[PDB]
Design an enzyme around this catalytic site. Structure first.
Site, PDB file in Angstrom:
ATOM      1  N   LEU A   9       0.823  -1.203   0.000  1.00 57.84           N
ATOM      2  CA  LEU A   9       0.000   0.000   0.000  1.00 57.84           C
ATOM      3  C   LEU A   9       0.861   1.259   0.000  1.00 57.84           C
ATOM      4  CD1 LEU A   9      -2.720  -1.140   2.572  1.00 57.84           C
ATOM      5  CD2 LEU A   9      -2.591  -1.539   0.102  1.00 57.84           C
ATOM      6  N   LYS A  45       7.027  -2.981  11.921  1.00 59.58           N
ATOM      7  CA  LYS A  45       6.262  -2.735  13.136  1.00 59.58           C
ATOM      8  C   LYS A  45       4.974  -3.555  13.129  1.00 59.58           C
ATOM      9  CE  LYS A  45       8.054   1.802  14.441  1.00 59.58           C
ATOM     10  NZ  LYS A  45       8.998   2.107  13.331  1.00 59.58           N
ATOM     11  N   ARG A  81     -21.616  18.705   3.726  1.00 59.80           N
ATOM     12  CA  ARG A  81     -21.548  17.400   3.078  1.00 59.80           C
ATOM     13  C   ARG A  81     -22.619  16.462   3.628  1.00 59.80           C
ATOM     14  NH1 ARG A  81     -16.062  17.681   4.418  1.00 59.80           N
ATOM     15  NH2 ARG A  81     -16.236  15.698   5.560  1.00 59.80           N
ATOM     16  N   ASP A 120     -15.833  28.784  13.513  1.00 59.42           N
ATOM     17  CA  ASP A 120     -15.000  29.684  12.738  1.00 59.42           C
ATOM     18  C   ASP A 120     -15.867  30.471  11.772  1.00 59.42           C
ATOM     19  OD1 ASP A 120     -13.058  28.337  14.116  1.00 59.42           O
ATOM     20  OD2 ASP A 120     -11.781  27.949  12.373  1.00 59.42           O
TER      21      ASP A 120
END
Ligand SMILES: Cc1cn([C@H]2C[C@H](O)[C@@H](COP(=O)(O)NP(=O)(O)OP(=O)(O)O)O2)c(=O)[nH]c1=O
Ligand SMILES: [Mn+2]
Ligand SMILES: [Mn+2]
Ligand code: NA
Ligand code: NA
EC number: 2.7.7.7
Length: 327
Positions: A56, A66, A177, A248
């Site tokens: 990937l 890991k 959205r 905001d």
DNA sequence: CCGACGTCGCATCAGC
DNA sequence: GCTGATGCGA
DNA sequence: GTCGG
């Protein structure tokens, strides 16, 4: 992909990501880990090996190794170790306070200030933003149900129009959205008298009205074009009161407005696709404008934009509803 | 081998 | 007091 | 840490 399908790996990677940003101050390692966690989260199979994961984009040798350790042992020695580190774990935690970044968290822990309690004992060492972040630590980590967002939108659109009916305001972000919950409220603001060519109380007057009706409760920052603050819905009778929320508000020139709406609607990955494609048709889109290349790469002057769909035309794509912009 | 990798408005700091 | 740098959020 | 010029 389901939640727990590779949850342990993505949890691990995200945890590593935070320590890089917050403790090591290695910000590109921070995005490296996140990109890995993102591409793995999308992957529709339970990963069996690091070599499998290494296929990937964004997963390299070190993360592949890991993952091998995690699959074989159920943990990661380095992560376990930094988890017990009183200094490092404290620094990473303190950065959860809005206004406390990696640098401030570092200096606090240097002088023994490690917990929220410690921060409470030491107000005189907190700037204005950090105090608000401390005050609303819990509230800021909660999400906002769409129903409350709709109520918040009601107030914002109402009070904006009341100040001047020629304002145009749009709540963008994940709300536009159509998400069923949101992290904050992103309000975009414009006005016919404000273009790139060209008063700057235009933003101040909106903030003050929302303060007057006690919707906006605190201010983190406020300039001529961008407001960052805190708001709260009124308490419905003698009932449990609403959490304080992040809002905001930013003022944008009319000719840059819909590029602004497009960008701050997102999502992230949709924005790049749409930025990314459209490169392949010789245009450069930024937060403010669309501009044409440019036979060897020199951008000409910004093109006229008066709707979102306009931008879609320019780069030849069907106008896509905000509802289908997760990617 | 080695540099790119996310940018920008505002608050506050560091230097003069 | 002014100018640029740094920290921060998103 | 990962990618790629
Ligand atoms: C921070 C950020 C925002 N944006 C655009 C897309 C985001 O959806 C939009 C608003 O930013 P956001 O509020 O940080 N993310 P969101 O509104 O989609 O999601 P949430 O409900 O706040 O969690 O602005 C980017 O394209 N790149 C970014 O790095
Ligand atoms: Mn948002
Ligand atoms: Mn936001
Ligand atoms: Na890879
Ligand atoms: Na923080």
């Amino acid at each position: 992909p389901q939640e727990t399908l590779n949850g342990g790996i993505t949890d691990m990677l995200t945890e590593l990501a935070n320590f890089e940003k917050n403790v090591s101050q290695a910000i590109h390692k921070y995005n490296a880990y996140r990109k890995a966690a993102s591409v793995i989260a999308k992957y529709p199979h339970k990963i069996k090996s690091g070599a499998e994961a290494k296929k990937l984009p964004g997963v390299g040798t070190k993360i592949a190794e890991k993952i091998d350790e995690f699959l074989a042992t159920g943990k990661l020695r380095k992560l376990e170790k930094i988890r017990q580190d009183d200094t490092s774990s404290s620094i990473n935690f303190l950065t959860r306070v809005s206004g406390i970044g990696p640098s401030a968290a570092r200096k606090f822990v240097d002088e023994g200030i490690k917990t929220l309690e410690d921060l409470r004992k030491n107000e005189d060492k907190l700037n204005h933003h950090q105090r608000i972040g401390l005050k609303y630590f819990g509230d800021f980590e909660k999400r906002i149900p769409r129903e409350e967002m709709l109520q918040m939108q009601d107030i914002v659109l109402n009070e904006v129009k009341k100040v001047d009916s020629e304002y145009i305001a749009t709540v963008c972000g994940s709300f536009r959205r159509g998400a069923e919950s949101s992290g904050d409220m992103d309000v975009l603001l414009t006005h016919p008298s404000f273009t790139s060519e060209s008063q700057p109380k235009l933003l101040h007057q909106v903030v003050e009205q929302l303060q007057k009706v006690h919707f906006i409760t605190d201010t983190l920052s406020k300039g001529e074009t961008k407001f960052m603050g805190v708001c709260q819905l009124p308490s419905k009778n003698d009932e449990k009161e609403y959490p304080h929320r992040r809002i905001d508000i930013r003022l944008i020139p009319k000719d840059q407005y819909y590029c602004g709406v497009l960008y701050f609607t997102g999502s992230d990955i949709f924005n790049k696709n749409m930025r990314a494609h459209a490169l392949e048709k010789g245009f450069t889109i930024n937060e403010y404008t669309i501009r044409p290349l440019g036979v060897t790469g020199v951008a000409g002057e910004p093109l006229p934009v008066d709707s979102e769909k306009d931008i879609f035309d320019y780069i030849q794509w069907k106008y896509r509803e905000p509802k289908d912009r997760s990617e």
